[PDB]
Every structure is written in structure tokens, then in C-alpha cells.
Amino acid sequence: GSEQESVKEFLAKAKEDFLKKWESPAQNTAHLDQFERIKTLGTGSFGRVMLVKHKETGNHYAMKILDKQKVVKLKQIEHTLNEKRILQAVNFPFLVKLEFSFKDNSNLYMVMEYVPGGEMFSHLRRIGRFSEPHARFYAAQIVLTFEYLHSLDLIYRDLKPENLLIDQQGYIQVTDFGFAKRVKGRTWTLCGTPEYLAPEIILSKGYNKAVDWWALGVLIYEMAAGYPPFFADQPIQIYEKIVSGKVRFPSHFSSDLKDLLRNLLQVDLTKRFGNLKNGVNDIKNHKWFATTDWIAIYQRKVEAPFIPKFKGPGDTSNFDDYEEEEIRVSINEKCGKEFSEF
Numbered sequence: 001g002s003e004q005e006s007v008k009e010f011l012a013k014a015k016e017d018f019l020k021k022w023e024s025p026a027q028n029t030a031h032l033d034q035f036e037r038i039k040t041l042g043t044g045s046f047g048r049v050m051l052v053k054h055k056e057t058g059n060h061y062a063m064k065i066l067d068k069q070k071v072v073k074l075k076q077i078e079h080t081l082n083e084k085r086i087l088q089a090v091n092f093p094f095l096v097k098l099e100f101s102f103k104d105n106s107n108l109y110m111v112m113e114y115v116p117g118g119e120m121f122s123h124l125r126r127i128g129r130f131s132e133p134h135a136r137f138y139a140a141q142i143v144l145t146f147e148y149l150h151s152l153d154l155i156y157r158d159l160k161p162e163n164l165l166i167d168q169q170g171y172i173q174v175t176d177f178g179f180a181k182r183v184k185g186r187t188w189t190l191c192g193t194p195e196y197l198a199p200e201i202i203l204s205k206g207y208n209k210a211v212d213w214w215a216l217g218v219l220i221y222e223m224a225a226g227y228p229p230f231f232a233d234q235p236i237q238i239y240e241k242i243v244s245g246k247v248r249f250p251s252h253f254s255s256d257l258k259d260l261l262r263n264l265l266q267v268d269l270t271k272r273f274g275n276l277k278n279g280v281n282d283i284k285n286h287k288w289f290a291t292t293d294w295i296a297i298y299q300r301k302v303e304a305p306f307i308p309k310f311k312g313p314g315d316t317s318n319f320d321d322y323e324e325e326e327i328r329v330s331i332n333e334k335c336g337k338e339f340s341e342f
């Protein structure tokens with residue numbers, strides 16, 4: 001009706017803000033030695049994330065640290081450069097704010113909002129499975145975020161409960177844009193967790209922003225069941241199940257839920273919700289989302305069905321423990337050419 005025009009005006013003004021920041025990025029807006037180290041919140045192959053404290057304000061932040069040589073080694077140069085470029089340009093309720101980003105001899109740094117509530121994946125594995133009103137609350141934030149990112153021609157490509165974190169109001173904060181990419185039309189890079197890959201990725205003949213909507217289906221299922229739809233011991237066996245498309249829903253799933261998941265986990269991307277003439281509004285006006293007030297979710301007015309524990313600031317009880325490894329600032333500037341524009 002009349003409310004369709006208001007959201008398009010918002011998305012237009014939203015794109016204008018994005019283009020102006022995409023055009024004129026912020027660069028080397030801080031340095032390591034104004035951040036006190038506290039704890040490792042996560043680790044990886046070519047990097048880690050850490051809880052750090054800014055000395056002048058006292059504020060706590062999550063500092064993603066990437067090893068330059070390791071980023072080159074695994075051919076993650078463009079990916080890394082995109083992540084920082086996309087983070088500093090975007091702005092939405094459920095996307096983490098990149099506050100500072102900078103560079104030294106051996107490493108890249110991305111200082112972001114600390115979200116103390118931990119990953120959705122950890123909460124899911126503790127509780128076992130979310131109820132449907134609980135999963136719908138989380139899924140509505142993803143539908144809005146994807147609408148916002150897709151309108152800016154940004155595919156996310158790394159949706160999973162691990163990347164969705166809980167803030168103290170019980171809402172979702174999307175972090176990790178390491179496989180995110182601005183792309184009109186097709187793109188090819190084989191990337192993402194095997195559980196969440198759309199079948200058109202695996203077939204390796206290009207793909208579009210509709211892979212995000214498949215990943216939404218995989219999320220909603222995993223949130224509701226407590227395990228993912230395509231599961232096996234190895235990832236190769238996960239791929240043969242995805243391309244076949246066969247999915248076994250549990251007894252306790254609603255028929256409204258099932259109808260959505262069959263429509264989101266569509267092998268034929270011609271018939272997949274999110275990639276039709278209405279696009280996202282087939283997902284918004286589905287029966288399963290009839291109870292969701294879309295404006296109220298954006299404004300963060302809806303009361304959260306889970307609000308996590310909070311002992312104090314700089315507390316990491318909602319995170320696993322890893323071995324505290326050293327940060328090595330080298331004397332010789334490594335890979336300066338490759339990460340010039342970071």
C-alpha cells in the first residue's frame with residue numbers, strides 16, 4: 001500500500017550514504033598502541049579477533065587482526081580489502097559498526113563494536129534449538145539486513161549462526177564481511193561454509209545475490225531444528241545432498257515453516273523466494289512472517305525473546321577460551337604493495 005513508497009525512499013537515501021562513503025573511505029584512523037590487549041575472542045587461519053580497550057575513552061572493542069603474509073598465502077587479498085571497504089561504507093541496525101581500521105608492518109587491523117552476548121551458534125548448541133517465534137525474530141533481522149545489502153548490490157555470502165552475535169538488547173549484530181562483495185550480476189568465487197552453500201555455487205557456473213536467500217533457509221532450519229538441513233561427516237557428501245535438494249523436516253516444524261523453507265531452499269533459482277518479481281516481499285508476506293511487525297524490528301522496539309547474561313564490561317563468559325598468542329610487529333614492512341589501499 002502506502003508504506004511501500006516510504007521504504008524505497010529510505011533505501012534510496014541509504015544508497016546515497018553508501019556511495020558517498022564507498023567513494024571517500026576512512027583510512028588508518030587509529031594505531032595499535034592506543035589499544036590495550038585483554039583477551040582473544042576468536043582465532044583463524046590468517047587472523048584472529050580480540051577484546052581490546054581504547055585508552056582515551058575507556059571503550060571496549062573487538063579488534064580483528066589479519067596477518068598480511070597469511071592473507072596473501074591463501075589468496076584473500078581482494079576479500080580482505082572488500083571487508084574493510086564494505087564495513088566502513090555500510091550503516092544498518094543489525095550490522096556491526098567498524099569504528100577504526102589501520103595498518104602496520106606485518107598486520108591489518110579492524111576495530112569494531114564489541115558485542116558481549118557471544119555467538120548465536122553457542123547459544124543454539126547450549127539450548128539445543130530455538131522455538132519458532134524465537135527463530136522468526138532472528139530471521140526477520142536477517143531478511144531486513146539482506147534487503148538493505150542487496151539493494152546496495154552487496155552479496156554477503158557467509159551467513160551462519162557463528163557470524164551472528166547477540167547484543168545486550170537481544171538483537172543480532174552481523175560481523176565478518178570476509179566473503180562479502182559488491183557485485184551487479186554474476187560472481188564466481190567458491191566460498192562459504194559447506195552447510196550454507198546454495199547449489200548454484202557448487203555447480204561453479206557463476207551465481208548471484210540469490211545465494212543469500214538460500215542461506216537464510218539454511219539458517220531458519222538450523223535455528224528451528226538445532227542442526228542444519230544438509231549434514232554429513234565430510235563436506236563433499238554435504239555438497240551432493242544440496243544439489244539433489246532433498247530435505248527432511250522434523251515433525252515439530254510448522255507447515256507454515258516448511259512451506260517457507262521449501263520456497264527458500266529451492267534448487268531452481270527461478271522459483272526461489274527473494275529472486276522473483278516481488279523479490280524480498282514474498283518472504284515478508286509469507287504466512288510464517290504474518291505475526292512479524294517489520295517496522296518494529298527495524299526500530300528495535302520488539303521485546304527480545306532472549307537477552308543474554310552480563311556480569312560486567314570487558315567480560316567474555318559468552319565466549320570460548322583460546323591460547324593467547326603474541327602480536328608480532330615486524331621492523332620490515334611486509335606486503336605494502338598488495339595492501340596499499342587498506
Ligand SMILES: c1nc(N2CCNCC2)c2cc[nH]c2n1
Pocket residue numbers: 006007010144147148294295298299
Ligand atoms: C520496512 N521499513 C523500514 N523503515 C522505513 C522507514 N520507517 C522505519 C524503517 C525499512 C528499512 C529497511 N527495511 C525496511 N522495512
